[PDB]
């Protein structure tokens, strides 16, 4: 539209000013950097953010103005081709161009092109393509889009071989893995990788995302859905629900059975809440029970009026019995029988939730034959659902991770290069980071977060110092620097070197990394003990100074002392831990009323790793603390945790690209790297150096 184009132009126009406004603000030194960022880094972030907010607004304007008759909108609507951005870029505005994440940089001295003035941080100078493809690009817009365009072609080109080799290594490490006739996953050595395929003994094709009802809702809402009380006139099953309704009231013997039923359902709820901590209900499980019920309903032409011919015993026991027939493992012995129970656990919680008495009668309105049929079908389906001995689950898993890696395009190393880091069990990783969760109580307390941030983020005498100076001040009692005259007059009233080491500290720096002259001085004093005489200017006093003296030949001696001071003296924090950011992560937690509710917390984000040390810090949750470096998790928390971290990490790489790979595949890889007792890499060094066959 003509007015939509005016409205778009005026959207860019206002964003263009918003940017100039932040630029004028930055040139006037009024800009205040975000903790753990350059004043400049902070600025560029804002500029980039406004310009994108703009491209999208301008886009969403056109997208709305295009009628349903728009052939492009029509393709986007069906999902046949194209997305929002395509409309936006074509109709309204192309947007900001990036190379290496940052805007077009100054290839020429202080400018992007020779058509610009130096020190031009304007959108037009750093690659913002204001125009739509329909309108056309200016030569500058054209070349910047060309730079940005070339970047993608480079990774498309490279990724292609990197991605290829990743695939090979996964395949060669897993090839010999398959399910044997004992449901055990073993390699060419008969070494057990997984005891049962993908911890459930099921084939992945036969699985579907299903909702575990029991898991969520209020404790009251659960009760209404599941509780049958034949000893209470209000909470009995109405005689409209089943034929025996009238004769069922007050049956103490029967009530014993509904008590077991409800007690199990409550047991299950707690258990599932232990497994899925967030309260996520939707999980991939075999047998779509929802569909079986739906079918029973049309198959049997279920009359949602007349009462059922079911007994409470018919339902209660029927389910109890079906459960014993859901066979994954067959052996006649405690080990194998307990194993069978284990594999079937989760599926049963679902089964018991969907087939509880109240549910079957009130909701499903099933007849005895309908129910009898539903039961047989769950059984049949479940059995068909188990993995087939012979399944080459090894290659499957490798290819199931390999193929998605092939489609791959706080700021942490992710995607293809991270997967590379992971598989290689890379010692010197690119983005090491700790995720420090706070102590239970003080979870919402921002001031507590700051306290730990301060107690953990590394601080050196160097980070606070403006400059150090060596002076010849021969009288320890009287000073050649008239400034210092007052500092002596006090730090004397209420033998040593004539050579003075005088350092000036930055008040602004001494504040962001909260510190006192007293505490800084104390560290130096406590470092050099009784072989260095330290004095310091007060936190109040205008200039921030620390005067130091030792206890023939002394010039070089003091130059060593100043290097020790700047480089080796640690003030606050833990070693290896730099840039600590405070973060308000959202956490799903059960409320007193039962329902899972958003209760966000303050979380710390590290720029480095030291597990052993940060764990022992007061004020954190040492039960919750996580690092992306699984090599550390392994070393500190054992091989079991090493496995859990290694999976978490692998899973993230896939899900970050917005892809889904079934658990089992990632689980298997993770397990194979694990089994040996450590971190066996998917490299010529790791797997290929095991006890397998020589030709292999």
């Amino acid at each position: 539209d003509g007015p939509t184009m005016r409205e778009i132009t005026e959207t860019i126009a206002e964003a263009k000013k918003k940017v100039l406004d932040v630029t004028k603000e930055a040139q006037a030194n009024l800009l205040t950097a975000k903790h753990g960022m350059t004043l400049r880094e902070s600025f560029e972030d804002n500029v980039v953010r406004f310009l994108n907010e703009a491209r999208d607004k301008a886009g969403r304007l056109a997208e709305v103005n295009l009628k349903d008759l728009n052939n492009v909108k029509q393709m986007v609507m069906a999902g046949s081709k194209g997305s929002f951005i395509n409309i936006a870029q074509m109709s309204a505005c192309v947007g900001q161009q990036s190379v290496e994440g940052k805007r077009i940089a100054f290839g020429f001295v202080d400018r992007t092109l020779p058509h610009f003035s130096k020190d031009d941080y304007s959108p037009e100078s750093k690659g913002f393509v204001e125009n739509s493809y329909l309108r056309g690009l200016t030569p500058q817009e054209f070349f910047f889009h060309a730079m940005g365009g070339r970047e993608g072609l480079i990774d498309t080109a490279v990724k292609t071989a990197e991605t290829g080799y990743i695939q090979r290594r996964l395949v060669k490490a897993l090839e010999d893995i398959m399910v044997h006739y004992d449901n055990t996953t073993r390699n060419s050595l008969g070494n057990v990788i997984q005891f049962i395929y993908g911890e459930d003994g099921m084939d992945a094709a036969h699985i579907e995302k299903q909702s575990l009802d029991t898991i969520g809702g209020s404790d009251a809402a659960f009760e209404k859905r599941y509780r049958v009380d034949l000893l209470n006139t209000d909470h009995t099953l109405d005689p409209s629900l089943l034929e025996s309704g009238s004769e069922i009231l007050g049956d103490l013997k029967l009530q014993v059975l509904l008590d077991e039923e409800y007690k199990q359902l409550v047991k299950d709820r707690k258990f599932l809440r232990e497994v899925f901590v967030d309260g996520e209900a939707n999980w991939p499980l075999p047998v779509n029970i929802r569909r079986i019920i739906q079918n029973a309903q049309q198959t049997f032409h279920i009359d949602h009026t007349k009462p059922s011919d079911l007994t409470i015993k018919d339902i209660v026991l029927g389910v109890k019995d079906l459960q014993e027939n859901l066979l994954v493992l067959r052996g006649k012995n405690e080990i194998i029988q307990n194993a069978q129970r284990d594999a079937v656990t989760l599926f049963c919680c679902l089964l018991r939730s969907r087939l509880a008495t109240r549910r079957v009668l009130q909701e499903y309105r099933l007849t005895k034959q309908a129910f009898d049929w539903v039961l047989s079908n769950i059984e049949a389906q479940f059995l068909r659902s188990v993995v087939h001995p012979g399944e080459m689950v090894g290659v499957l898993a490798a290819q199931s991770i390999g193929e998605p890696a092939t489609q791959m395009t706080k700021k942490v190393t992710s995607g293809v290069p991270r997967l590379k880091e992971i598989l290689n069990v890379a010692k010197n990783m690119k983005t090491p980071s700790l995720t420090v969760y706070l102590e239970p109580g003080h979870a919402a307390d921002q001031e507590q977060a700051k306290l730990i941030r301060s107690a953990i983020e590394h601080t050196t005498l160097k980070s606070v110092t403006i400059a150090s100076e060596i002076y010849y001040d021969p009288d320890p009692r009287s000073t050649v620097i008239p400034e210092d005259e007052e500092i002596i007059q006090l730090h004397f009233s209420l033998q040593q070197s004539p050579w003075l080491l005088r350092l000036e500290l930055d008040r602004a720096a001494m504040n962001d990394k909260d510190l006192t002259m007293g505490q800084v001085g104390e560290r130096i004093k406590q470092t050099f003990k009784n072989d260095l005489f330290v004095i310091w200017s007060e936190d109040n006093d205008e200039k921030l100074i620390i005067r130091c003296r030792v206890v023939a030949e002394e010039d070089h001696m003091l130059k060593k002392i100043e290097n020790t001071m700047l480089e080796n003296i640690t003030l606050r924090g833990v070693e290896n831990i730099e840039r600590v950011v405070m973060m308000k992560y959202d956490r799903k937690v059960p409320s007193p009323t039962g329902e899972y509710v958003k209760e966000p917390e303050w979380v710390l984000e590290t720029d480095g790793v030291n597990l052993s040390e940060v764990m022992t810090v007061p004020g954190i949750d040492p039960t919750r603390i996580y690092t992306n470096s699984f090599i550390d998790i392994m070393e500190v928390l054992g091989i079991e945790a090493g496995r859990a971290a290694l999976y978490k990490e692998v899973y993230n790489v896939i899900a970050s690209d917005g892809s889904y790979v079934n658990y089992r595949h990632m689980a298997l890889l993770v397990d194979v790297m694990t089994t040996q007792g450590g971190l066996t890499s998917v490299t010529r060094h790791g797997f290929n150096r095991s006890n397998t066959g020589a030709l292999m």
Partner: protein, 230 residues
């Protein structure tokens, strides 16, 4: 790109001989603290000496090139901030020709040396098939600028659109910037010349997504047609 050429490589001596004669103190007699603001002069990464008033020297050297006395393929750059004057007689440097703009105009502002009279003077020679490209080059209307020299210049994209200041607007046309600069040393002959042989057959490449253009400049190489009449 279409207008790109590569420096054949000339002789440095006529320039070294010229320099010494134009106020260049030889390095052999340099005394850093005596002349401390001295602009250091290089010819092919060889420091030959220093000069006290580079402003005037630079103008003489530029007039030498724009006349033809100093070859047009020779690159000479003056980084004022760094106090350096580097000269390249050197072979292998990629250069492009640009229109020269001069503050020099009795009547008004800073204006492109080339005038509508030269343009008709060329199209007269276009009808003949006496005024060549060399004719524009020796009349110092146009110049050769390599990447190192590009660093110190300031180019206008369009001449007419980027010259006289402001003393309604079509909505269908693309959003364009301005001629805010009063400093303009050069002007772009035509911005489409940034493109190579293959990309120059792409119709409206300013209306395509960046790689779709990169694709065509690869496919057209595999397109059938008459390759030669023989």
């Amino acid at each position: 790109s279409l207008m790109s050429c590569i420096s054949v490589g000339t002789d440095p001596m006529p320039i070294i001989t010229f320099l010494s004669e134009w106020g260049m103190e030889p390095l052999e007699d340099y005394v850093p603290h005596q002349s401390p603001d001295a602009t250091r002069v290089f010819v092919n990464g060889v420091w030959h000496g220093v000069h006290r008033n580079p402003a005037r020297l630079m103008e003489t050297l530029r007039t030498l090139r724009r006349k033809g006395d100093i070859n047009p393929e020779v690159s000479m750059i003056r980084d004022i901030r760094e106090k350096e004057l580097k000269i390249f007689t050197d072979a292998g440097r990629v250069y492009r020709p640009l229109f020269i703009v001069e503050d020099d105009e009795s009547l008004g502002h800073k204006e492109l040396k080339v005038r509508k009279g030269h343009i008709a003077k060329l199209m007269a020679t276009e009808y003949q098939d006496e005024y060549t490209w060399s004719s524009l080059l020796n009349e110092g209307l146009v110049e050769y600028i390599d990447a190192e020299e590009e660093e110190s210049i300031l180019i206008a994209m369009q001449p007419e659109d980027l010259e006289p200041a402001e003393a309604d607007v079509d909505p269908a046309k693309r959003i364009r910037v301005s001629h805010h600069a009063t400093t303009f040393t050069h002007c772009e002959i035509h911005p489409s010349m940034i493109l190579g042989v293959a990309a120059s057959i792409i119709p409206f490449p300013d209306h395509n997504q960046s790689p779709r253009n990169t694709y065509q400049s690869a496919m057209g190489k595999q397109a059938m047609g008459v390759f030669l009449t023989n």
